[PDB]
Amino acid sequence: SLSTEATAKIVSEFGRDANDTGSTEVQVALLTAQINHLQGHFAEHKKDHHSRRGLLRMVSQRRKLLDYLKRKDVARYTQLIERLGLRR
Amino acid sequence: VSMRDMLKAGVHFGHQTRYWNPKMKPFIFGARNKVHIINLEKTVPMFNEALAELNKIASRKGKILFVGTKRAASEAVKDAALSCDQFFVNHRWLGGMLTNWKTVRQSIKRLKDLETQSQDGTFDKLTKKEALMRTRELEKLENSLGGIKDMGGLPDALFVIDADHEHIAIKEANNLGIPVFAIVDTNSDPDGVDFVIPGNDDAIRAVTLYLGAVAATVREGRSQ
Amino acid sequence: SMQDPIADMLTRIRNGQAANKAAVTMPSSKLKVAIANVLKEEGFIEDFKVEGDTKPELELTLKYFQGKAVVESIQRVSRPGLRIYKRKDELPKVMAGLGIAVVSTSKGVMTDRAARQAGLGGEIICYVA
RNA sequence: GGCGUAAAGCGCACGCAGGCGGUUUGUUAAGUCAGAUGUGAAAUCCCCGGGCUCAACCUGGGAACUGCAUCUGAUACUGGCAAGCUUGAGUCUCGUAGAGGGGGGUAGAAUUCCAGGUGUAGCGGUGAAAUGCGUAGAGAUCUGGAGGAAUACCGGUGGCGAAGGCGGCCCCCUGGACGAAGACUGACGCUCAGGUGCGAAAGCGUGGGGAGCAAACAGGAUUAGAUACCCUGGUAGUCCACGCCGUAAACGAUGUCGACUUGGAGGUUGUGCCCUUGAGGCGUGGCUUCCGGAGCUAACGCGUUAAGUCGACCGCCUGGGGA
Numbered sequence: 001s002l003s004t005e006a007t008a009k010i011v012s013e014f015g016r017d018a019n020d021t022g023s024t025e026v027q028v029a030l031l032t033a034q035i036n037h038l039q040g041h042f043a044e045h046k047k048d049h050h051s052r053r054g055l056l057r058m059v060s061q062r063r064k065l066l067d068y069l070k071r072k073d074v075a076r077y078t079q080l081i082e083r084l085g086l087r088r
Numbered sequence: 089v090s091m092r093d094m095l096k097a098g099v100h101f102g103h104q105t106r107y108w109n110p111k112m113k114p115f116i117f118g119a120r121n122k123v124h125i126i127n128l129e130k131t132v133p134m135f136n137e138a139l140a141e142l143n144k145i146a147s148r149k150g151k152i153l154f155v156g157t158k159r160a161a162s163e164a165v166k167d168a169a170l171s172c173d174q175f176f177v178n179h180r181w182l183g184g185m186l187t188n189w190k191t192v193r194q195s196i197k198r199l200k201d202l203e204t205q206s207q208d209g210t211f212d213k214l215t216k217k218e219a220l221m222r223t224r225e226l227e228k229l230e231n232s233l234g235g236i237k238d239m240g241g242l243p244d245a246l247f248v249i250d251a252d253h254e255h256i257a258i259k260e261a262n263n264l265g266i267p268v269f270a271i272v273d274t275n276s277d278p279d280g281v282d283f284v285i286p287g288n289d290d291a292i293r294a295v296t297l298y299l300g301a302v303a304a305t306v307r308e309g310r311s312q
Numbered sequence: 313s314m315q316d317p318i319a320d321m322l323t324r325i326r327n328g329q330a331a332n333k334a335a336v337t338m339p340s341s342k343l344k345v346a347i348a349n350v351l352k353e354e355g356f357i358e359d360f361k362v363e364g365d366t367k368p369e370l371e372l373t374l375k376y377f378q379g380k381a382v383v384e385s386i387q388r389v390s391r392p393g394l395r396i397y398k399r400k401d402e403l404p405k406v407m408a409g410l411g412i413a414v415v416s417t418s419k420g421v422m423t424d425r426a427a428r429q430a431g432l433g434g435e436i437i438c439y440v441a
Numbered sequence: 442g443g444c445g446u447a448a449a450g451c452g453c454a455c456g457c458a459g460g461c462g463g464u465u466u467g468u469u470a471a472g473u474c475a476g477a478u479g480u481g482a483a484a485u486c487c488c489c490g491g492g493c494u495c496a497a498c499c500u501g502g503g504a505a506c507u508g509c510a511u512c513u514g515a516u517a518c519u520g521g522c523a524a525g526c527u528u529g530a531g532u533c534u535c536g537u538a539g540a541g542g543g544g545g546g547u548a549g550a551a552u553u554c555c556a557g558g559u560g561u562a563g564c565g566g567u568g569a570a571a572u573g574c575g576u577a578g579a580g581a582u583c584u585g586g587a588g589g590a591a592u593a594c595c596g597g598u599g600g601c602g603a604a605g606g607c608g609g610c611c612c613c614c615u616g617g618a619c620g621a622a623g624a625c626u627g628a629c630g631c632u633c634a635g636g637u638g639c640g641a642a643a644g645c646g647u648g649g650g651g652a653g654c655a656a657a658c659a660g661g662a663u664u665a666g667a668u669a670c671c672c673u674g675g676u677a678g679u680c681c682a683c684g685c686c687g688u689a690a691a692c693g694a695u696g697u698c699g700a701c702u703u704g705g706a707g708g709u710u711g712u713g714c715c716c717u718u719g720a721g722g723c724g725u726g727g728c729u730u731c732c733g734g735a736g737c738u739a740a741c742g743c744g745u746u747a748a749g750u751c752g753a754c755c756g757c758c759u760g761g762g763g764a
């Protein structure tokens with residue numbers, strides 16, 4: 001998974017505090033970082049279905065978090081999807 | 089009945105924690121060295137109520153049937169039931185002594201006829217082969233039905249030791265509506281009994297204490 | 313997941329009655345407290361208390377008569393998958409009147425005969441016989 | 442009304458539409474409820490009478506027409522809206538166990554083959570035989586080499602994985618689960634038609650590889666026959682890379698999620714406490730095996746890992762054949 005330092009950096013830049021590790025923005029950012037990191041692994045290991053299942057779990061969890069955020073506050077949703085480079 | 093005498097007699101002791109019956113949870117005080125300890129504060133009032141009901145049954149022209157067949161409580165049950173003009177089953181309980189009384193009545197008649205023709209009759213037509221045969225049949229029939237030969241009918245109350253060991257007698261008494269007074273240990277089933285007396289039923293001094301108390305109360309009931 | 317807490321309360325009561333439990337505890341709620349009030353005033357449970365402030369815990373004291381269950385039957389009628397509403401002229405009577413039917417009328421949660429005397433209908437919460 | 446065995450749980454999972462949804466406050470009055478108004482043609486149905494000499498029949502009045510719309514109120518529940526809350530659901534910290542997956546390397550035992558030494562008449566196989574190999578030197582034994590496949594002991598109603606499945610050792614990449622104490626977000630949840638993905642073995646396509654085993658095939662037996670079982674060989678295949686296939690008694694013949702309900706003995710993996718006496722005792726989680734209580738079941742049996750008591754959603758069944 002992500003190292004401790006990368007996780008701390010993401011939590012700091014996406015959270016309202018250094019301890020706000022549960023915010024929707026922090027969770028979506030961590031999931032996006034893990035997906036982007038896994039992208040390179042699966043480019044080389046196209047036959048790793050067992051890990052791709054966890055990758056798809058991460059993708060679906062990020063999708064549900066983004067849906068909840070868009071339904072809750074669309075402004076933060078837009079800021080997040082522009083800061084992370086989403087929307088296909 | 090005295091909780092000091094009870095605790096000195098070994099009543100509070102129970103079986104190991106594995107063999108316990110969860111229905112005996114209200115009467116269990118705790119555990120020490122993986123054996124259950126019966127709550128004597130629960131034991132003494134239930135024993136007193138059972139003794140009161142036994143005294144009522146005795147004073148109201150009743151017949152008590154003392155049931156216990158373990159090698160620990162056989163002779164004790166015999167002594168207790170003979171000490172108060174009562175009846176006992178201190179050896180194997182024949183399946184159907186109560187529910188099938190119309191059939192064991194014939195065996196009682198046979199035992200009585202054999203013992204009368206042996207003692208008072210004194211046939212002396214021995215043949216030295218049918219005589220020993222008849223004496224062995226008489227001794228078997230007496231070891232089986234020696235306690236209830238003078239009962240006449242069904243009793244009015246059963247006093248059972250080791251309610252788990254004597255489940256057949258309890259089920260028969262329940263089928264016939266006879267109240268059951270049973271010493272229910274931590275491993276026995278207290279469902280089929282009317283007056284459950286939670287106490288140790290394996291130690292000899294505990295069962296002698298129970299039987300002495302019951303004999304005293306039924307004698308005071310007999311003498312009104 | 314937990315999608316019907318009222319049926320959960322009824323099931324807890326039924327299972328505690330079948331297991332000869334002295335009292336049953338559960339997470340509290342306004343509707344649960346109203347139904348427990350209706351059950352206590354009708355004589356199906358002994359008492360009930362709500363403990364806790366941030367996470368209230370409702371505790372019902374079950375009732376027995378002859379070593380037997382006082383609540384013989386308790387069923388959820390209106391449920392999330394199928395809501396049941398009745399008018400005052402078609403309010404149900406359980407056990408031909410010996411049982412009660414907890415009804416949620418616009419004047420609070422009450423029994424079926426109380427809602428009938430009040431000239432009201434509403435959602436049939438449960439049947440208690 | 443059902444789906445363990447009688448017909449019936451998709452092989453497994455992700456997930457859009459849909460269905461359902463913890464808890465508090467306020468507001469609305471859409472569902473819901475109450476009242477009123479309008480309407481609900483007549484006949485028919487039903488009730489009390491009347492006339493046909495009775496009946497059928499005719500007929501007066503009533504009830505009914507369980508419905509729809511409108512208007513006025515109620516606010517408990519469901520819904521909408523707004524603000525919350527932490528117990529459901531997730532994130533972070535530190536660790537733990539594991540044949541979880543993908544890639545590369547390597548080790549030993551054994552089979553087969555090639556070359557050579559010793560050595561001589563058998564070997565192999567079977568119920569018994571024969572086919573087969575062998576005086577061109579087999580089998581046995583010893584030495585060296587080649588190649589492929591699978592990993593003895595550990596090893597275990599043991600472990601991991603959604604399922605299918607996963608077993609030498611090492612390294613690289615990587616998923617999930619669990620536990621301790623906290624912090625964080627604040628219903629973000631459950632299920633899921635269609636959809637997508639994974640999916641034993643066999644099989645197919647292309648390119649390799651090929652020791653052992655072995656469909657087809659050949660021969661020897663057995664037999665009345667023997668297109669078989671048995672024996673001697675043996676091609677595809679089994680192995681690798683990449684695609685396809687999408688099926689299994691894909692089984693727990695038992696869909697997923699959540700709550701509640703007496704116990705006993707174990708296994709495995711964390712964690713806490715105590716002169717730690719000890720490989721100790723006492724708690725507390727996760728997964729797991731056997732027995733068994735109430736209950737349930739046609740019975741067998743299931744039984745806190747339910748086939749018990751419930752809730753949400755989905756799939757499926759409607760006599761046996763045809764099929």
